[PDB]
Amino acid sequence: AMDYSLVKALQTAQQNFVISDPSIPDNPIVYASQGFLTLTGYALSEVLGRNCRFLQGPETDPKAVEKVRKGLERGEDTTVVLLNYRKDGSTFWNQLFIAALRDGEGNVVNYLGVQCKVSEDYAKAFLKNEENE
Numbered sequence: 001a002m003d004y005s006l007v008k009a010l011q012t013a014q015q016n017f018v019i020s021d022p023s024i025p026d027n028p029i030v031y032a033s034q035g036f037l038t039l040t041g042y043a044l045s046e047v048l049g050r051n052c053r054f055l056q057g058p059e060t061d062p063k064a065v066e067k068v069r070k071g072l073e074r075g076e077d078t079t080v081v082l083l084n085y086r087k088d089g090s091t092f093w094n095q096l097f098i099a100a101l102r103d104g105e106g107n108v109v110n111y112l113g114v115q116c117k118v119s120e121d122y123a124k125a126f127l128k129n130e131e132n133e
């Protein structure tokens with residue numbers, strides 16, 4: 001990974017994460033941790049140069065996808081819970097944490113996304129609580 005100290009910190013905990021490069025059209029993945037590859041069932045060669053939206057499918061809530069899109073557009077750290085699909089078509093609940101990695105002038109150089117698999121019970125409680133705003 002472009003070796004930011006926070007990326008090295010996530011590697012020591014064997015977290016699931018990807019790094020995107022917004023200078024490339026459609027803000028594709030340029031790095032994916034072994035944890036992300038094992039969670040999703042994809043080989044690194046199948047993920048590099050693609051936008052992470054390939055994990056979405058028919059049971060994914062498009063309103064959770066829209067929260068991510070608007071968060072990035074507004075330059076905000078974003079946390080959502082949404083249903084994602086593995087390569088084999090099995091589904092899981094993904095608590096997704098996205099941050100901009102910025103230079104000294106505040107320009108976004110990369111996005112960092114951490115995926116945490118959560119239970120259906122946890123996802124329902126998170127989404128119910130989100131809806132009380």
Ligand SMILES: Cc1cc2nc3c(=O)[nH]c(=O)nc-3n(C[C@H](O)[C@H](O)[C@H](O)COP(=O)(O)O)c2cc1C
Pocket residue numbers: 018019020027051052053055056065066068069072082084094096098111112113114115
């Ligand atoms: C670093 C990064 C990691 C992401 N990881 C995921 C993910 O694991 N699952 C997912 O459904 N979307 C993920 N996304 C969201 C999509 O890439 C995309 O931003 C989202 O679908 C909204 O844009 P769209 O309306 O063009 O689809 C991630 C985005 C970024 C920038």
